C-alpha cells in the first residue's frame, strides 16, 4: 500500500502476492514489472528518435533494413497503446488508485495523448510501400515520420522521475540529461543541413557539394559522417573552416543554429559549474575550519596536545549540527508525529523516577509534545542560578553534575541513560540550584516548565502525593 510507493522509487517496487490495491485484470502503474517495460520503451524511443530524423534527411534509408526495423518498434508501441487501458493512474484531488476500466478509458481517450500516440504509431511509409510499389520520393512527404518525435515525452517523464528519486545523484542526472539533449540536437542539425544540401538545385554550390562532388551517389553513411562532423565542429565552436556555408539557405539556417548554440553551451557550462560548486560545498567548509584553527594555534605557541583537543572537538560539532538536520518531523501532523515519538520515547519516559505511577493520559500528553536535541561532549545544558523553564530526560550518553562554588567546580555525580536532571528547580519553582554539562555526544528531552505544570495540575485529577512520595525518596 501507500502513496509513497507510487511517488518515490523511480523504477517502482516489487508487488507481492496479496497487495490490497491489486485487482483482477489490472496492472498498477507503480509495479516493477511495468516500470521496467516502460523503460524498454524508452530504449526503443532512443532508436526511433534517431531513425526518424535519419530517414527524413537521407531518404534512401527506407529502401533497406530501417524500414522493417521500425515496424517491430511500431508494434511494441502498438502493444502499449492498448496495454494502457488496464493501467491504474494516481488521481489528483483524491490521491487514490482509479481502477475501474471505464474511468481509465474515459481519461485516456479524452486526452490528446491518445490521438497523438495513435498517429505516432501509424506505419504510413510501409502503408505507401504496400499500396504503391515503393516510397519513391518526396521533398515534404518525408515529414510524416516527424510525428514519431512525439514519443520523446517518455524520455522527459523518465528524467523527470529520476530527479526526484534521491537514490540517484541529482546534478549528475541533470548532466546526463543535458548530454542526451545535446547529441540529439547535433543529430537534428546534421540531418537538417544535409537535407538542405540535398534538395538544392545545382548541387555543386552546397556546403558538401563543394568538397565531395558526387555526394548524392555515395553511401548514406559518408554523408552522415560529414554532417555529424560539421555539426560537431560548429557546436563545439572549433570551426576548422572546411565545410562552411556557401549559399543563402545554409547561411540562414547555420546562423540560427550557432545562435542557439551560444545558449546551449552556456547552459551546459552552468550545469557543470553548479555540479562542481555544490559537490564541494561542505568539504571546504570543514577545511576552512581546520585551517584557521591551525593558523591561530601556530601564530601563538599552544602545545599540540591542546591543539588536537580543538581539532578532535569541532568534528563533534559538525556531527551534532548534522544530526539536528535529520530532524524532519517538525511539520508532520500531530496524529502521526505522536506515534513516532510514542514508539521512540514511551519506554524511556514512563519508567522515569518521577513519572512513575502516572495515568496513561498524561503520559501520552507528554510523549506527544516532546522533541529531542543533541549536545556536544562538553557543553553545559543548564547552569546554576537560572530560572527553571526546562528539565531534561537524557536517553543516550551521559551528563555530569556540578554546582557553583568559590573553587572552579566539583564533579559530584554521573548520570546514565534514562535519568532526569535539573528537576529540583522546575519542581520547587526556585531557580536552578545546579549545573549540568555533558560528557559525551548525548541526546536529551526537554520539558517546558509552564506547560508541564499546567498540564499536570489541570488535565488530570488523579495525581497527588505520589509524585511527592517518589520526589521525597531522592
Amino acid at each position: 500500500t501507500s502513496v509513497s510507493s507510487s511517488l518515490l522509487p523511480a523504477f517502482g517496487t516489487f508487488i507481492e502476492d496479496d497487495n490490497p490495491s491489486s485487482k483482477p485484470f489490472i496492472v498498477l502503474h507503480f509495479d516493477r514489472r511495468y516500470r521496467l517495460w516502460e523503460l524498454f520503451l524508452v530504449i526503443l524511443v532512443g532508436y526511433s528518435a534517431w531513425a526518424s530524423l535519419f530517414e527524413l534527411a537521407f531518404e534512401k534509408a527506407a529502401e533497406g533494413a530501417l524500414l522493417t526495423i521500425d515496424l517491430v518498434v511500431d508494434f511494441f508501441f502498438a502493444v502499449d497503446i492498448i496495454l494502457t487501458f488496464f493501467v491504474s493512474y494516481l488521481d489528483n484531488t483524491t490521491y487514490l488508485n482509479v481502477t475501474d476500466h471505464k474511468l481509465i478509458a474515459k481519461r485516456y481517450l479524452k486526452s490528446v495523448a491518445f490521438v497523438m500516440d495513435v498517429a505516432s504509431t501509424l506505419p504510413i511509409q510501409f502503408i505507401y510501400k504496400t499500396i504503391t510499389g515503393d516510397v519513391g520520393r518526396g521533398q515534404a512527404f518525408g515529414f510524416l515520420n516527424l510525428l514519431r518525435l512525439w514519443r520523446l515525452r517518455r524520455v522527459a517523464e523518465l528524467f523527470k522521475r529520476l530527479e526526484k528519486d534521491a537514490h540517484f545523484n541529482y546534478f549528475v542526472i541533470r548532466v546526463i540529461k543535458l548530454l542526451c539533449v545535446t547529441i540529439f540536437w547535433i543529430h537534428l542539425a546534421g540531418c537538417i543541413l544535409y537535407w538542405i544540401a540535398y534538395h538544392y538545385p545545382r548541387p555543386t554550390d552546397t556546403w558538401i557539394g563543394s568538397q565531395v562532388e558526387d555526394f548524392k551517389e555515395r553511401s548514406v553513411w559518408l554523408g552522415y559522417t560529414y554532417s555529424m562532423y560539421w555539426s560537431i565542429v560548429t557546436l563545439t565552436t572549433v570551426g576548422y573552416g572546411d565545410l562552411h556555408a556557401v549559399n543563402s539557405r545554409e547561411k540562414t539556417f547555420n546562423m540560427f543554429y550557432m545562435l542557439f548554440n551560444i545558449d546551449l553551451t552556456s547552459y551546459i557550462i552552468g550545469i557543470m559549474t553548479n555540479l562542481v560548486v555544490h559537490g564541494a560545498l561542505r568539504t571546504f567548509a570543514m577545511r576552512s575550519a581546520i585551517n584557521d584553527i591551525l593558523r591561530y594555534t601556530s601564530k601563538n605557541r599552544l602545545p599540540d596536545t591542546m591543539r588536537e583537543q580543538m581539532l578532535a572537538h569541532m568534528q563533534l560539532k559538525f556531527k551534532t549540527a548534522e544530526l539536528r538536520q535529520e530532524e524532519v518531523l517538525q511539520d508532520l501532523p500531530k496524529a502521526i508525529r505522536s506515534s513516532i515519538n510514542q514508539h521512540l520515547f514511551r519506554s524511556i519516559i514512563e519508567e522515569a523516577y518521577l513519572f512513575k505511577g502516572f495515568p496513561e493520559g498524561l503520559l501520552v500528553q507528554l510523549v506527544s509534545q516532546i522533541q529531542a536535541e543533541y549536545f556536544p561532549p562538553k557543553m553545559e545544558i543548564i547552569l546554576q542560578n537560572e530560572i527553571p523553564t526546562d528539565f531534561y530526560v537524557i536517553v543516550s550518553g551521559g551528563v555530569d553534575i556540578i554546582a557553583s562554588k568559590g573553587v572552579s567546580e566539583q564533579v559530584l555525580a554521573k548520570l546514565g541513560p534514562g535519568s532526569m536532571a535539573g528537576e529540583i528547580g522546575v519542581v520547587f519553582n526556585i531557580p536552578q540550584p545546579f549545573t549540568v554539562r555533558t560528557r559525551r555526544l548525548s541526546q536529551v528531552i526537554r520539558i517546558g516548565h509552564h506547560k508541564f505544570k499546567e498540564m499536570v495540575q489541570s488535565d488530570n485529577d488523579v495525581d497527588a502525593k505520589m509524585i511527592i512520595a517518589n520526589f521525597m525518596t531522592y
Partner: protein
C-alpha cells in the same frame, strides 16, 4: 497615468522601438538616400512618436517622495521638459527634412533615434520586478536581445567599413564575391550577419575575415567586446540554472534525512512508509499552493487570524456544537486551529485512544469504522463540514470510533487543553453541552 489606455499604448511604442532598433543601423550601413519603401514607413513611426511627446504632458508621474501621482500640470510640464525632452524632440525630426539642411548626414542622423531604446530598457526593468512572468524567460530573453542587437549593429558597421572604401576588391566582402556592390540587399545583409555571428560565437570559419587594417582594427575591438559579453552570458546562465531548483532539491534532502532518521533509530517498516507518505504529500500540496505554513506562521496572529477567518468562518457555524454562540468565541476558536492534510487510508483517530484532539473536516470524506474481534464494521461516514472526536474529548472517555481518510482529506485541528482554557469564558459552555446532548437524539 496608470490605466490600460496608457499600457496598451506605452507597450505599443515598444514594438515600434524594436522596429527602429533594426531600421536605424540598417539605414546607417546599407543605404545612402531615403529610398521609398522605408522613407514613408519611417515617418509613420515618427508621427506615432510625435504623438507621445505631447501626450506625455497629460501624464501623472509618481515619485516615492509623494508616493502617489502628482496631477500638477505645470509640474509635469517642467519635469518632462527638464531631461528627456530635447532628446525625444530631436529623435523624431523627419530625416527627409534633415537632409535639406546638410546632405551626407542622412545615415548618421537616423542613429540619433536609437535614443528610443530607453523604452525597451525600461520595459525590461519593469518585467523583471514583477510576477506572473517566468523569471527564467525574462533573463533568457534580455540577454538574447542584447546579443541580437550587438550582432546586428556590428554587421551594419562592418559592412559600411567595406562599402566606404576605394578598390572594393580589397575589402573583407569583395575578397569573397568579386562584385558585391551588384547584389541584392538581402544578400549583403545575410553575408554581413553571417560573418557577425560566426565571430560573436567564436566559431570563426575563416572565410570573410579582415583584409586591410581598418577592418583589422574594427575586428580587434569587436572581439574584445565579445569576449566580455560571452563571460557575462555564462555568468548569468549559471544563476538561472539554480532557479526553481530549490524546491525539488530540498525535497531530496528531506527524503534523505527521513531515511537516515528511520535508519538510526531502527524504526519498523510500518511507520517509515507512514512518514514518507506524509512527507511526499507535503511536497505535492506545496506544488499546488494548497497550504504553506511557512507563509502563515511568518505573519503575526493578529493578521494570521483574518486569513483563517475568511477561509474557515463560513464553515465553522454549520456544525452542531456551535449553533448559538456570540461571534467572539467563534472567532477565538477559528483563530487557533491548525490546518493539516492527510493522505488516503490513514487513521487520524483510532479507537480506545486517550482523547486529546478533535478535528473538523473541510475537504474529503472519511469513514467511522470500529473493530471488535472484527474490522470492516463501517458504521457511518462524514462529509466536509462535520466534526469528529467531540464527545470523546468533552467527556474524557476514550475514542469511540476510528476514522480513516478515504481521499486526500484536510482537517482543522484543536487539542483539548487549548479548547478547555478558551472555553473558560462565560456560560457558553452551557449552550455547548446542551447542543451535544440534544445531538444524539
Amino acid at each position: 497615468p496608470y490605466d490600460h489606455k496608457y499600457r496598451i499604448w506605452e507597450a505599443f511604442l515598444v514594438v515600434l522601438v524594436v522596429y527602429t532598433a533594426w531600421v536605424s543601423p540598417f539605414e546607417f550601413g546599407f543605404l545612402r538616400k531615403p529610398r521609398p519603401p522605408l522613407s514613408i514607413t519611417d515617418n509613420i513611426v515618427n508621427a506615432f512618436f510625435a504623438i507621445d511627446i505631447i501626450m506625455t504632458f497629460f501624464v501623472g508621474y509618481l515619485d516615492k517622495s509623494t508616493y502617489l501621482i502628482v496631477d500638477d500640470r505645470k509640474q509635469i510640464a517642467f519635469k518632462y521638459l527638464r531631461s528627456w525632452f530635447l532628446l525625444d524632440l530631436v529623435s523624431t525630426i523627419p530625416s527627409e527634412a534633415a537632409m535639406r539642411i546638410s546632405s551626407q548626414s542622412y545615415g548618421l542622423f537616423n542613429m540619433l533615434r536609437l535614443w528610443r531604446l530607453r523604452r525597451v530598457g525600461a520595459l525590461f526593468a519593469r518585467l523583471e520586478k514583477d510576477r506572473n512572468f517566468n523569471y527564467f524567460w525574462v533573463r533568457c530573453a534580455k540577454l538574447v536581445c542584447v546579443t541580437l542587437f550587438a550582432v546586428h549593429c556590428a554587421a551594419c558597421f562592418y559592412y559600411l567599413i567595406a562599402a566606404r572604401n576605394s578598390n572594393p576588391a580589397k575589402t573583407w566582402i569583395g575578397a569573397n564575391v568579386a562584385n558585391f556592390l551588384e547584389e541584392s540587399l538581402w544578400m549583403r545583409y545575410v553575408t554581413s550577419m553571417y560573418w557577425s555571428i560566426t565571430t560573436l560565437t567564436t566559431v570563426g570559419y575563416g572565410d570573410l575575415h579582415p583584409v586591410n587594417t581598418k577592418e583589422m582594427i574594427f575586428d580587434i575591438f569587436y572581439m574584445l567586446f565579445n569576449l566580455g559579453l560571452t563571460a557575462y552570458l555564462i555568468g548569468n546562465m549559471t544563476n538561472l540554472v539554480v532557479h526553481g531548483t530549490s524546491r525539488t532539491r530540498n525535497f531530496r534532502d528531506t527524503i534523505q534525512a527521513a531515511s537516515n532518521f528511520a535508519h538510526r533509530n531502527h524504526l519498523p517498516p510500518r511507520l517509515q512508509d507512514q512518514m514518507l507518505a506524509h512527507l511526499c504529500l507535503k511536497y505535492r500540496t506545496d506544488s499546488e499552493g494548497l497550504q504553506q505554513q511557512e507563509t502563515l506562521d511568518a505573519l503575526p496572529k493578529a493578521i494570521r487570524s483574518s486569513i483563517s477567518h475568511f477561509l474557515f468562518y463560513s464553515l465553522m457555524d454549520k456544525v452542531y456544537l456551535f449553533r448559538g454562540v456570540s461571534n467572539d468565541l467563534l472567532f477565538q476558536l477559528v483563530s487557533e486551529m491548525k490546518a493539516e492534510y492527510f493522505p488516503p487510508k490513514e487513521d487520524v483517530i483510532l479507537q480506545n485512544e486517550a482523547p486529546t484532539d478533535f478535528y473538523i473536516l473541510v475537504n474529503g470524506t472519511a469513514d467511522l469504522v470500529d473493530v471488535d474481534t472484527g474490522t470492516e464494521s463501517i458504521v457511518r461516514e462524514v462529509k466536509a463540514g462535520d466534526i469528529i472526536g467531540e464527545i470523546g474529548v468533552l467527556c474524557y472517555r476514550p475514542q469511540l470510533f476510528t476514522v480513516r481518510t478515504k481521499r486526500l482529506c484536510q482537517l482543522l485541528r484543536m487539542n483539548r487543553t487549548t479548547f478547555l482554557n478558551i472555553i473558560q469564558a462565560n456560560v457558553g459552555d452551557g449552550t455547548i453541552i446542551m447542543n451535544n446532548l440534544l445531538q444524539h437524539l
